[PDB]
Amino acid sequence: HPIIQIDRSFMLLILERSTRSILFLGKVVNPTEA
Amino acid sequence: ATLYKMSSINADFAFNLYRRFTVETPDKNIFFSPVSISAALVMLSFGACCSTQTEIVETLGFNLTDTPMVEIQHGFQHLICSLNFPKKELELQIGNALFIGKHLKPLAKFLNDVKTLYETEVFSTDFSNISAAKQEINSHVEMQTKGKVVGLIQDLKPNTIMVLVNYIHFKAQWANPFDPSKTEDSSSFLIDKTTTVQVPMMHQMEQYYHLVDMELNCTVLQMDYSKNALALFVLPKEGQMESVEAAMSSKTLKKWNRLLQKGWVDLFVPKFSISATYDLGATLLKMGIQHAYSENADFSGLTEDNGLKLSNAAHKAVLHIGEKGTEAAGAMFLEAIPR
Ligand SMILES: O=C(N[C@@H](Cc1cc(I)c(Oc2cc(I)c(O)c(I)c2)c(I)c1)C(=O)O)c1ccc2c(c1)C(=O)OC21c2ccc(O)cc2Oc2cc(O)ccc21
Numbered sequence: 537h538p539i540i541q542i543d544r545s546f547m548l549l550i551l552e553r554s555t556r557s558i559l560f561l562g563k564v565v566n567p568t569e570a
Numbered sequence: 571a572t573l574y575k576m577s578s579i580n581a582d583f584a585f586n587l588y589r590r591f592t593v594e595t596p597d598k599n600i601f602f603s604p605v606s607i608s609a610a611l612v613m614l615s616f617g618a619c620c621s622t623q624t625e626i627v628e629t630l631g632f633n634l635t636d637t638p639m640v641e642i643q644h645g646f647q648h649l650i651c652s653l654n655f656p657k658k659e660l661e662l663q664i665g666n667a668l669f670i671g672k673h674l675k676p677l678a679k680f681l682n683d684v685k686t687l688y689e690t691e692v693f694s695t696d697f698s699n700i701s702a703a704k705q706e707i708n709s710h711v712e713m714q715t716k717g718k719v720v721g722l723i724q725d726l727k728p729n730t731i732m733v734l735v736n737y738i739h740f741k742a743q744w745a746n747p748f749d750p751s752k753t754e755d756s757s758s759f760l761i762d763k764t765t766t767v768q769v770p771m772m773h774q775m776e777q778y779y780h781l782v783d784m785e786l787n788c789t790v791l792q793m794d795y796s797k798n799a800l801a802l803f804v805l806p807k808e809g810q811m812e813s814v815e816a817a818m819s820s821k822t823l824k825k826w827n828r829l830l831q832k833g834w835v836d837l838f839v840p841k842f843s844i845s846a847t848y849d850l851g852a853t854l855l856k857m858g859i860q861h862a863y864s865e866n867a868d869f870s871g872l873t874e875d876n877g878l879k880l881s882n883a884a885h886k887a888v889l890h891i892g893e894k895g896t897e898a899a900g901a902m903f904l905e906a907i908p909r
């Protein structure tokens with residue numbers, strides 16, 4: 537099976553289905569940033 | 571169906587604003603609620619007239635010939651209503667509050683409209699005690715985001731006479747939660763070419779919708795929540811983040827929705843939290859909202875005397891992803907002073 541390792545910079549969308557709305561949008565460069 | 575055309579314009583606004591942020595703060599974490607930002611600005615537009623009003627909705631991405639002003643208003647009202655409709659297993663609430671100065675002369679129509687049509691709570695607020703006002707508003711936002719958005723407003727102008735806030739809170743469980751017994755305590759995450767940080771790395775092997783975009787050179791993974799929501803992870807190939815950012819659009823999302831196929835993936839996802847803040851005053855100005863800030867601002871639909879103008883705007887948003895699911899919240903602040 538293919539491996540997907542989210543271990544470097546990525547974009548993230550959180551979507552609501554019924555309205556097709558983007559609730560949140562981001563890019564994670566440093567997940568431990570204070 | 572009827573909501574889709576709007577949510578699509580809202581999505582392109584999200585990506586355009588995202589790209590402005592990547593210019594403002596390059597190679598840094600970005601995180602925001604586009605629906606929060608859009609919803610707050612549409613609320614303000616409800617009391618605006620003429621070019622003040624048209625600049626706001628055009629800046630949000632609408633074409634008034636394609637979608638008349640009244641249709642935009644009705645649409646956003648329907649959107650907020652639909653998002654707040656109770657869905658089992660999903661916590662999602664989006665709401666607004668208007669903090670109106672003691673001496674403001676708000677139109678009874680504006681107040682009844684926002685209360686009845688736009689999930690708005692109205693509070694009479696004494697801005698003469700600016701410190702206490704700021705605390706009241708911050709505490710309200712904190713409460714409505716289940717404690718997750720703290721200190722939204724850092725400074726409040728002493729001559730403030732109205733504040734409009736929008737808040738969103740989201741908490742959902744993964745359709746397929748991670749087993750914390752399979753989470754690696756300390757795993758490497760590349761933050762730049764020569765530098766890693768350590769994060770807990772969750773791990774499962776499940777069937778997920780995914781694809782490799784052959785044009786954009788990125789992997790796209792969909793992780794469902796247990797009802798009515800999903801997360802999309804976009805992992806560009808080495809060196810391709812900028813080109814992927816340039817390509818993000820509603821068109822790209824529509825393409826991926828067709829191409830996503832469900833199959834087995836050996837999946838590693840970090841457990842983490844982040845937070846981000848944005849001073850949006852100047853950004854919204856650059857994007858086309860001009861008259862709202864001016865001495866000739868037209869908010870004749872809001873107060874008797876057209877007595878206010880926009881002065882400042884800010885957004886804060888927070889995210890946590892862990893084995894059980896995701897919790898995220900955001901809030902938008904719009905400040906008004908005498909015109
Ligand atoms: O893969 C599925 N498509 C989903 C996921 C999805 C993908 C994307 I990209 C976007 O963003 C987006 C799409 C579009 I078109 C536009 O214009 C914009 I602007 C943004 C969204 I929003 C969603 C989709 O709903 O489009 C998929 C669909 C349905 C299901 C699954 C994947 C899945 O795993 O099971 C279902 C599913 C999911 C949730 C739920 O509550 C019920 C349910 O039931 C069913 C029933 C059938 O028959 C088929 C699939 C699923």
Ligand SMILES: [Ca+2]
Pocket residue numbers: 753754755756
């Ligand atoms: Ca371990």
